[PDB]
Amino acid sequence: MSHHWGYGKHNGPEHWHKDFPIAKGERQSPVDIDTHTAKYDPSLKPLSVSYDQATSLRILNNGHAFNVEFDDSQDKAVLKGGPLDGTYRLIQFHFHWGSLDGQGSEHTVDKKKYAAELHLVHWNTKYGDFGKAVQQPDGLAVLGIFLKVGSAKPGLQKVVDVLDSIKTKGKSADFTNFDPRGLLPESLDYWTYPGSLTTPPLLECVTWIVLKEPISVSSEQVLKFRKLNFNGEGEPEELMVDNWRPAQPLKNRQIKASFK
């Protein structure tokens, strides 16, 4: 591990366990979603996505992906219902994507990989702050949304057009008044299971909610993702591509479906 962990040959997912032993734990993410094995659970409530008062602040290239950050000091953008007990506040979203359209998602569906995957990260307000929440088995809820390449996603374009300004690791830009509702598909049908963060520290603190319906983005939109850099300014260019962890063993877990 050079600096530290990453997605390259010498510091990628196969290496992570040496510094983060929980990498080989009992509820690691992502996983393959076997649609024929997932069971419909009629006791699952509809998801409540309440993003009308969302306050985006900033977008950051963190050397792994880019994060769009939100004001989470109040209940402005929250996720509730579904498998969740209580209220989860949106803190950021980010993506994972590939070097080619046939790979890039972290979760897979009957072993199918999508071109990318969007993660909207939320923390359980009963734990007071994000740092405390990640130390709890029900601390986080991540809403995962698949991306396929086809027609453009209009609500994604504002994100795409600011990426030139955060090309390299550590760069940030003002990113206020962005509406994350524009990134959602029509349907909120989902699969859910207990899992983990998919990068180090790989903490097993996440209730995963993965939407069945992918969104479509254009080839031009995803091409601009692939022009980002893992490296910092003034360093040799390493294109930011294939920043996804592969599917992990399901072990003693059941994936539940919200839909028939």
Ligand SMILES: NS(=O)(=O)O[C@@H]1CCN(S(=O)(=O)[C@@H]2O[C@@H](CO)[C@@H](O)[C@H](O)[C@@H]2O)C1
């Ligand atoms: N893929 S996931 O399961 O949704 O987890 C991602 C990756 C890890 N978290 S995180 O700890 O909140 C996140 O991780 C860091 C870098 O990987 C920070 O740069 C950053 O401050 C950030 O808020 C979210």
Ligand SMILES: [Zn+2]
């Ligand atoms: Zn993620």
